[PDB]
Design a protein around this nucleic acid. Structure first.
Lengths: 92, 114, 272, 85, 64
RNA sequence: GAACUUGAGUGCAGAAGAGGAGAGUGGAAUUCCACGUGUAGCGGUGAAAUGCGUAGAGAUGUGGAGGAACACCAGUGGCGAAGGCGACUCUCUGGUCUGUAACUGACGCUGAGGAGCGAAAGCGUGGGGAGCGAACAGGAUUAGAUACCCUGGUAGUCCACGCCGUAAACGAUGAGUGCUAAGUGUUAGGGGGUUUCCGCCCCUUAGUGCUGCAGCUAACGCAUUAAGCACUCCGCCUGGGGAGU
C-alpha cells in the first residue's frame, strides 16, 4: 500500500495530461501494482515556486504493490519533465 | 516615480539605509558612516535616524512617496530609522521584520572570549 | 577490484595489478579485429615526433562504435572483455540482427542487459541518447562534438560527465577536469560512468611493466648536454639555472598556457 | 514473515500446540539468522543488527545445549534437519 | 488547553487535510508548540510529521 | 530419574521510537559567479588598524554553481549496551514495551581470556571543499604578546573503504534478581466506574524527573531509577611523588 501524490506541471493540454496520467499508470502496472483509488485536486497554487511555477496539478494514486514499480515510478518521475513533484508514502 | 521599498540593514556596527525601487533598483543610499560618524557612533540610533533622514531627502529628490520598509540585521537603530522616515515627509506602510534566518546551515565563527 | 602482489622479490615490492573480475572471456571476435602496426612515435617522414614511446607488447585493434549508429534495435551485452587499446574494458553486444559491436563498458553493466540506442530510448546505464533527450544531471560518457561523427569527450576508464542544463541548440556539460562546455544538442552521448574505475590505482612495479605498455624511458633535461636541452650542462647537478623551467624546445612549461589565443571554440567554453 | 514462521512451526511441531518446544524455536532462529545474515552481506556497515544477530546466536546456542542435555536423538535429528553443523 | 485529536477522535492526520494543518501552523509558517495548541505529545508528533510532508509537496509553506 | 510454572523463552495481538545501514529529494541561509540600480564607503573594534572598495565594493534585484548542517517541532521527550542518534521519503534490518494465555519447562545469571562496537582528533588511498578553522601571515594590545581581540587562511571538518582504539568514554555509581513509607509531574501501554462521547476518577505495568520516611554515609547527600537490606558473579584499590615513567 502506497499513496502516490505528484504534481503535473500546469502548462499542459488536457489530452496530453491524460496521456501523462496514463503513462505513469502504465508504469505502475508493470508490477501488478493495482490502482485502488484515484483523486485529482486540480490546479492548486503552490505555497512556493518549484521550477518556475506558482501552480500545479495534483494527482493521488493509491497503489497496493510489491515495492518495485514504486521505485520505477520514482526514477521515471525524476526524469520526466512534465512533472513538478512526487512523493510515495507507505500508507500505514 | 512614486513607490519603492526602503531596505534598512542595521547591524552592531552600521545602520545602512538604501531606498530602492519595488523590483529592486536603488534610488539613493546613505549609511551611518556616510553621514560622517566613523566610530562606534555608527551603532547609535541617532546615526540611524540621520541616515534615514538623508536617504529620505534623496528619495524625495527623485520623488517617491509611499515606501514599504524592510528591517534587516541585528542592531539598535531600526525603530528610530522607521520613525525618521515618517517625520521626513514619507509614509511607512508595511514593516517587514526580515533578518536573514538560516535554518541550520553553515556553522558560525567561534565564540569570542575563548 | 585490485590484486596486490606479495613482495617475493624487489621487482614486485609495491606492484599491484587489477584482478580482472569484470572480464568474462579472453577471446575477442575475429570479425571485429584489425591489425595494429606500432609506430614508435615516428612519422611519415620517419623522424621521432613523439618521445618515450614504442616497443611494447604487440596489440591487435578492436573496432568500437563511438557513433552508436544503430537506433531502435535493442542490444544485449554478450561479453565484457579486455582492450589493450584503451584503459577501459569493452562490451561486446549482440543486436537482434547479428551486428555484433564493441562499445565501451560502463561502470556496473553486466552480461545480458538491454541496450537501446535510439533518440527515444529509455535512460539507463548503457543506452545512448542525444543530449536533447537526456535529462539534466545524469552521468554521461562517450559524448561527441559533431553529430554523427562518433564519441569524443568522456571515453576512458572511470570517467564521467554530467548535463548541467540546456539552452537551445546547445547543452551545458561539465566535462572531466571540471570544464563547462556548450555542446551541440544533437550530439549523441551514452549514459553513465565508464567501467574500470580502479585503473588509476595500479602501482606498476617494475621498470619493465611500463615498457610492456610501450613506454621508453625519460631522461631529464638537467642530465643532458647544452645542445640537447636548455637545462643541460652545469658542472654537477645544476638547478634549473634559467628562469621558467623549459621543454627541450623554446617554451616554458610550468603554468604556461598553450591553448591558441584565437581558438574558435572559446565561445562554447563557459568555465574552465 | 508469516509464511516462514508458520511453515517452520508446522514443520517442527512435535505436538500440535507447539509454538514453544525448542525445536520450533531453534528453527525460527536459524531462518531469522539467515535472513539477517544476507542483509549483513548486503550492508556490511550495520552493527546494531550484528549485535542483534549475536544475541540470536546466543539464544539458539543455549537452546541447542538444552536439547543436547535433554534429548540426544531429538538434538541430532534437529541438527540433520536444519543443517546446523 | 484541550487536545484537538482526543476531542474529535480523529486518527492518522491525513496530509490532504491542508486546512487542519494550516490551523496548527503559525502565521509565518512555523509549527506551533504543544503549549500553544494544547495537543498531546503523540498527536504533536504525527502533526509535525504531517506538516513536514505537506511542506515538501508545497501544500504548506516554509517561510512567510 | 520423574513432575511443576512463577524465572527464562517461543506463539498471538497491538503501540511507540532522532535504533541502524543504502539510495533519492527538499527549503532557508552562507560563499562565489554574471548582469541591472548607484555612489563612497563597507567591514571590524573596548579604541583602531590590517583587509575589501571608484578597475565600482557593502546595500539591493534576478539567475546559476557548489558544499555542509537540518530553524519552528524540541520537551529532566524518545530510542540504543555504550559511543551515540534530529529535514523528508522509500529499500533492507535490530531491539524494546504492553495484554495475556496457547506452548516449552529451569532452557537461567555472571563471565577472566577471546571476538566485536567504540565520540573527537589522527593515519592511508581516492574524491570533496560552502562556512568554519589548527598551522601560518598581516593588524592591534602589551614592558614583551609565538595569546585572548581583528582581518586572512592550510590540513582537517564532509564522503567511500581500511587503520587507531583513546575521552571529565560521567550517574565520576558493573551486571542480574528479590525485598524496603509516601507525595508528585511526565512518556508509551492496559483495565475498571456513569456517559455512545468529550472527559474525570480509580487501578496496574515498563521507562523517565523532583521532593521526601526508615535505613545508609565522614559529610555532601542517596533514598523503590539506592548510596538501604541481602544473595550471585566480574572488574578494580591498598599513602603521595618518581609514574602510567
Amino acid at each position: 500500500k502506497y499513496e502516490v501524490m505528484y504534481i503535473i506541471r500546469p502548462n499542459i493540454d488536457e489530452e496530453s495530461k491524460k496521456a501523462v496520467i496514463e503513462r505513469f499508470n502504465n508504469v505502475l502496472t508493470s508490477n501488478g501494482a493495482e490502482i485502488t483509488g484515484t483523486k485529482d485536486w486540480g490546479k492548486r497554487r503552490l505555497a512556493y515556486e518549484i521550477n518556475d511555477f506558482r501552480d500545479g496539478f495534483y494527482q493521488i494514486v493509491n497503489v497496493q504493490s510489491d515495492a518495485a514499480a514504486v521505485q520505477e515510478f520514482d526514477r521515471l518521475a525524476k526524469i520526466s519533465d512534465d512533472i513538478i513533484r512526487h512523493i510515495v508514502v507507505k500508507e500505514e | 516615480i512614486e513607490s519603492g521599498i526602503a531596505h534598512i540593514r542595521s547591524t552592531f556596527n552600521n545602520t545602512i539605509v538604501t531606498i530602492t525601487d519595488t523590483h529592486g533598483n536603488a534610488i539613493s543610499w546613505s549609511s551611518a558612516g556616510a553621514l560622517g560618524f566613523r566610530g562606534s557612533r555608527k551603532s547609535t540610533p541617532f546615526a540611524a535616524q540621520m541616515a534615514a533622514e538623508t536617504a529620505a531627502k534623496g528619495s524625495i529628490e527623485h520623488g517617491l512617496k509611499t515606501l514599504e520598509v524592510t528591517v534587516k540585521g541585528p542592531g539598535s537603530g531600526r525603530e528610530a530609522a522607521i520613525r525618521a522616515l515618517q517625520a521626513a515627509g514619507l509614509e511607512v506602510t508595511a514593516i517587514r521584520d526580515v533578518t536573514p534566518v538560516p535554518h541550520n546551515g553553515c556553522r558560525p565563527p567561534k565564540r569570542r572570549r575563548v | 577490484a585490485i590484486k596486490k602482489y606479495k613482495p617475493t622479490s624487489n621487482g614486485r615490492r609495491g606492484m599491484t595489478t587489477s584482478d580482472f573480475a569484470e572480464i568474462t572471456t579472453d577471446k575477442p571476435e575475429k570479425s571485429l579485429l584489425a591489425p595494429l602496426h606500432k609506430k614508435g612515435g615516428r612519422n611519415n617522414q620517419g623522424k621521432l615526433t613523439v618521445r618515450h614511446q614504442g616497443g611494447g607488447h604487440k596489440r591487435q585493434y578492436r573496432v568500437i562504435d563511438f557513433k552508436r549508429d544503430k537506433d531502435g534495435i535493442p542490444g544485449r551485452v554478450a561479453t565484457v572483455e579486455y582492450d589493450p587499446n584503451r584503459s577501459a574494458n569493452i562490451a561486446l553486444i549482440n543486436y537482434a540482427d547479428g551486428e555484433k559491436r564493441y562499445i565501451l563498458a560502463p561502470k556496473g553493466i553486466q552480461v545480458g542487459t538491454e541496450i537501446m540506442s535510439g533518440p527515444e530510448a529509455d535512460i539507463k546505464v548503457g543506452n545512448a541518447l542525444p543530449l536533447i533527450n537526456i535529462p539534466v544531471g545524469t552521468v554521461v560518457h562517450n559524448i561527441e562534438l559533431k553529430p554523427g561523427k562518433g564519441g569524443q569527450l568522456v571515453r576512458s576508464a572511470g570517467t564521467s560527465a554530467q548535463v548541467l542544463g540546456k539552452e537551445g541548440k546547445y547543452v551545458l556539460v561539465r566535462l572531466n577536469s571540471g570544464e563547462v562546455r556548450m555542446i551541440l544538442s544533437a550530439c549523441r552521448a551514452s549514459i553513465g560512468q565508464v567501467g574500470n574505475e580502479q585503473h588509476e590505482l595500479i602501482n606498476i612495479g617494475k621498470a619493465g611493466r611500463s615498457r610492456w605498455k610501450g613506454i621508453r624511458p625519460t631522461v631529464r633535461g638537467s642530465v643532458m648536454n647544452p645542445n640537447d636541452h636548455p637545462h643541460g650542462g652545469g658542472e654537477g647537478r645544476a638547478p634549473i639555472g634559467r628562469k621558467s623551467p623549459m621543454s627541450p624546445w623554446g617554451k616554458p612549461t610550468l603554468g604556461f598556457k598553450t591553448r591558441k589565443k584565437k581558438n574558435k571554440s572559446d565561445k562554447f567554453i563557459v568555465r574552465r | 514473515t508469516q509464511e516462514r514462521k508458520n511453515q517452520l512451526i508446522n514443520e517442527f511441531k512435535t505436538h500440535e500446540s507447539d509454538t514453544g518446544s525448542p525445536e520450533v524455536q531453534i528453527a525460527i532462529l536459524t531462518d531469522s539468522i539467515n535472513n539477517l545474515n544476507e542483509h549483513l552481506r548486503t550492508h556490511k556497515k550495520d552493527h546494531h543488527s550484528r549485535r542483534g544477530l549475536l544475541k540470536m546466536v546466543g539464544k539458539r546456542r543455549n537452546l541447542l545445549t538444552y536439547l543436547r542435555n535433554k534429548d540426544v536423538t531429538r538434538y541430532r535429528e534437529l541438527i540433520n534437519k536444519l543443517g546446523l553443523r | 488547553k484541550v487536545c484537538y485529536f482526543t476531542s474529535n477522535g480523529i486518527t492518522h492526520i491525513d496530509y490532504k487535510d491542508v486546512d487542519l494543518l494550516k490551523k496548527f501552523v503559525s502565521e509565518r509558517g512555523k509549527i506551533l508548540p504543544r503549549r500553544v495548541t494544547g495537543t498531546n505529545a503523540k498527536y504533536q508528533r504525527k502533526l509535525t510529521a504531517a506538516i513536514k510532508r505537506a511542506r515538501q509537496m508545497a501544500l504548506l509553506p516554509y517561510v512567510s
